[PDB]
Design a protein around this ligand. Structure first.
Ligand SMILES: *[C@@H]1O[C@H](CO)[C@@H](O[C@@H]2O[C@H](CO)[C@@H](O[C@@H]3O[C@H](CO[C@H]4O[C@H](CO)[C@@H](O)[C@H](O)[C@@H]4O)[C@@H](O)[C@H](O)[C@@H]3O)[C@H](O)[C@H]2NC(C)=O)[C@H](O)[C@H]1NC(C)=O
Ligand SMILES: *[C@@H]1O[C@H](CO)[C@@H](O[C@@H]2O[C@H](CO)[C@@H](O[C@@H]3O[C@H](CO[C@H]4O[C@H](CO)[C@@H](O)[C@H](O)[C@@H]4O)[C@@H](O)[C@H](O)[C@@H]3O)[C@H](O)[C@H]2NC(C)=O)[C@H](O)[C@H]1NC(C)=O
Ligand SMILES: *[C@@H]1O[C@H](CO)[C@@H](O)[C@H](O)[C@H]1NC(C)=O
Ligand SMILES: *[C@@H]1O[C@H](CO)[C@@H](O)[C@H](O)[C@H]1NC(C)=O
Lengths: 200, 200
């Protein structure tokens, strides 16, 4: 740049320039015109808006032209007082984002078993403590095979969000049956079991 | 990214990343970690400083590692409540500057001439009005040749900064002399003159 010569009482243009990326949008652009030496503010374009002229009320941008990278300032009704160096600061912000999901877990304790002590309906109870998230519960006999029966299973969360699972199987008996509870944590893939065996 | 699995009561790390330019410095970087859905603030690094953890007091950056582009966040003493998606916003600011100097000008009016009316010391007076900046003043005879003599020249600025120049030449007379004043504006390179001619 050479200096800009302006007749007193006329309007003048102070050049400034940038090269915008194809992405570009004015919400990115942050633009300050300042008196070089003092660093007093003259005109600003920030946060997708054209703020005013700061003190003068005699300055303007070419708001239709910014997006194309013209940050030149227009100074009106020039006067001796305006003489000096002006500095144009142009900051473009490129914002990127990434997301990350946190999955929380806790293990369930070894279950504790309970019943009402051979063609009779009896109830077995599986209780396992303080795991997260909700567990998958499986009842099965001693050779891995699902037990038939009515099972009620509830899972109750404490103050800290952790679950205690309480699962109740009502069965009719067979003289030699083992009965098992597997409490699974899907997320950790940890398995907890207990089992009663009934002969007599 | 896959999701991050954290045992309750342990510490976990949420990854985030950037690729910095060789220029790069932390005063450029603006960094927000937010709960994706709510958009509540978790942790920020702005204006060359690491602001705190926002609400939790359980979060940290790796401040020694930012400059290399690691914006990962450390979450401490994890709990069910923390479960969710987190979003990391990374804005880098590249600031450029240019300076432009405004040189103001105004033209001087045609000078007006005055004297005390042939081997006598007389005084001629050049007055020119409202120019800017200070002018160069030249006294000369009628064939372009500098006049010898004592010249006093003063330049006085009005309310608006503009100069009136008043230049006084004291000469001894020669029976046939033309006397001239050239008032020059260096900046505009406009010349203003007046002249008296003296026969009798
Ligand atoms: C940013 O956009 C600006 C807004 O359009 C551009 O400004 C324009 O620039 C063009 C090309 O250089 C100028 O065209 C020239 O204008 C002069 C007229 O004389 C000057 O004096 C009057 C005062 O009476 C004042 O209005 C201006 O300062 C004038 O420049 C002609 O002699 C030339 O032949 C030619 O037509 C436009 O005048 C100018 N417009 C304004 C309002 O300044 C600028 O070029 C762009 N900058 C960048 C970096 O891209
Ligand atoms: C940003 O910088 C981070 C700070 O150093 C980097 O984090 C480090 O990443 C390395 C490489 O992947 C990890 O090394 C692995 O760590 C695990 C240890 O188990 C995890 O569990 C404990 C909880 O008890 C917890 O401290 C962490 O979440 C652990 O990751 C090992 O099994 C691996 O073999 C290997 O050693 C560092 O542990 C990790 N440090 C921390 C504090 O997280 C990160 O890689 C950088 N990110 C980017 C984008 O560059
Ligand atoms: C600047 O302009 C506003 C109108 O937008 C006006 O209210 C204010 O008084 C002006 N200030 C000066 C110093 O001219
Ligand atoms: C966060 O930490 C500051 C100490 O830096 C402490 O004064 C403030 O009470 C903390 N807030 C919470 C909610 O723990």
């Amino acid at each position: 740049e050479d200096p800009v010569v302006a007749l007193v009482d006329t309007d003048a243009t102070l050049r400034c320039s940038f090269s915008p990326e194809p992405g570009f949008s004015l919400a990115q652009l942050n633009l300050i015109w300042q008196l070089t030496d003092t660093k007093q503010l003259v005109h600003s374009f920030t946060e997708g808006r054209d703020q005013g002229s700061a003190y003068s009320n005699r300055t303007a941008l070419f708001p239709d032209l910014l997006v194309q990278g013209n940050a030149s300032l227009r100074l009106q009704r020039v006067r001796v007082t305006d003489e000096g160096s002006y500095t144009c600061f142009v900051s473009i912000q490129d914002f990127d984002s990434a997301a990350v999901s946190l999955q929380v877990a806790a293990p369930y304790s070894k279950p504790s078993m309970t019943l009402e002590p051979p063609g009779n309906m009896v109830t077995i109870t599986c209780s396992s403590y303080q795991g997260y998230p909700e567990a998958e519960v499986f009842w099965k006999d001693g050779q891995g095979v699902p037990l038939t029966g009515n099972v009620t299973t509830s899972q109750m969360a404490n103050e800290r969000g952790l679950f205690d699972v309480h699962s109740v199987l009502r069965v009719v008996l067979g003289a030699n049956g083992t009965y098992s509870c597997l409490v699974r944590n899907p997320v950790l893939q940890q398995d907890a079991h207990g089992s009663v065996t009934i002969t007599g």
